Ligand binder design. Structure first.
Ligand code: FMN
Ligand code: FMN
Lengths: 217, 217
């Protein structure tokens, strides 16, 4: 299609049709979107939990307790549910893992280029984790970037979705043991196909006018 | 479908052709992407600076002069340069603006619906600004989401781009007086067409394997 049409037509679904599942290919395609998102210094400071089974989605849905009950059925009724997670701290093993992967994929012709790349990444990494002490926040920003890429991507696939911040991160982290693995949950994105109960599918889209939000120079 | 090819083929441009400019329509399409990105509670906590003139781009490139000379080159050679900014504090004036805009767009059927929507947004707002004291970080995350949406969008438009954290936001804020207007710069994204010196255009893309970053349940 035309990507502008996608952006103007996509929406946050508030009700999914539990009967409509992702095709096997679509399930793979959304995982490709998660993987190939850009990130600062290609740090890829993230982990994804993709729930497709009834039990899997139920476990994620435990995070929608208390004041977050309105998002529970969205997690349950959707075909697939993606939990976007950020690393809790930027460690050297991860930095080594990323540059070795780039080396393996053939982005360096000389060991000097590889050394240059690695040391440049460590500079920014250290700037955040030793100078500004905001590496946790800095990595979370990269994940939200991934989310933005993902929402546009699935919409272009003709898939319905909704990003969710309305959940208990503490419960969700505990359910999948994320703290001990070095991650924390940030956004939950159910994906599938909306039902007729989705009031947001027929409502007009609303954004602030550009004269307020945008300045041209 | 199509979008996956876009996700696999896009790349961060390392060198722009200073002779290739966006068409007037492409200029409009870029601003459409900025405007219609989703955000938590549709809070839209952002401002955009789109530099299309050489004087405008030079003002932006000031943030990269000296300690970010390679970033500075990309800002100067690219056709359009978008500066993503976040609100420094979520205030009641903005919350009112958002809900009045949604009202003006006919999203509410009853005055009660507007009051409910309004109370819901202020609840999450208060949670961040008063309980968690992280409304600045919360709003910054939404802007990064907008960037993620933007990069995929412009790639699908067949345009080259690169997200840039390598700049001095202090200098950039001072140049446009963002602080006093209630904003701060986060990410700069030059947009245009790459040149022959863009080595990254013919390098293989590198990402961590899914058996490291992704868990299926
Ligand atoms: C970070 C983020 C978190 C969100 N969390 C929720 C949520 O918890 N519940 C919900 O119904 N919608 C949630 N949304 C969807 C927003 O309400 C929606 O993006 C906004 O109203 C704009 O409407 P649109 O996405 O249909 O264009 C979230 C969106 C974002 C970007
Ligand atoms: C938040 C952010 C900031 C970035 N800043 C820079 C930058 O300052 N200079 C640069 O050359 N690339 C920058 N990049 C591009 C990354 O290097 C690039 O996205 C990553 O290496 C993956 O490569 P790809 O975008 O070509 O797929 C940035 C990317 C992101 C997401």
């Amino acid at each position: 299609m035309d990507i502008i049409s996608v952006a103007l037509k996509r929406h946050s679904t508030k009700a999914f049709d539990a009967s409509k599942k992702l095709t096997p290919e679509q399930a793979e395609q959304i995982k490709t979107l998660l993987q190939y998102s850009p990130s600062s210094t290609n740090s890829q400071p993230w982990h994804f939990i993709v729930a497709s089974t009834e039990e899997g989605k139920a476990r994620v849905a435990k995070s929608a307790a208390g004041n977050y009950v309105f998002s529970e059925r969205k997690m349950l009724d959707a075909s697939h549910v993606v939990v976007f997670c950020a690393k809790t701290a930027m460690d050297d093993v991860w930095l080594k893992l990323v540059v070795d992967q780039e080396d393996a994929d053939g982005r360096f012709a000389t060991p000097e280029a590889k050394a240059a790349n690695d040391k440049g990444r460590k500079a920014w990494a250290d700037m955040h984790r030793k100078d500004l002490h905001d590496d946790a926040e800095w990595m979370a920003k990269q994940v939200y970037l991934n989310v933005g890429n993902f929402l546009l991507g699935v919409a272009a696939l003709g898939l319905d979705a909704v990003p969710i911040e309305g959940f208990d991160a503490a419960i969700l982290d505990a359910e999948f043991g994320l703290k001990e693995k070095g991650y924390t949950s940030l956004v939950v994105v159910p994906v599938g196909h909306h039902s007729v109960e989705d009031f947001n599918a027929t409502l007009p889209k609303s954004r602030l006018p550009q004269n307020i939000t945008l300045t041209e120079v």
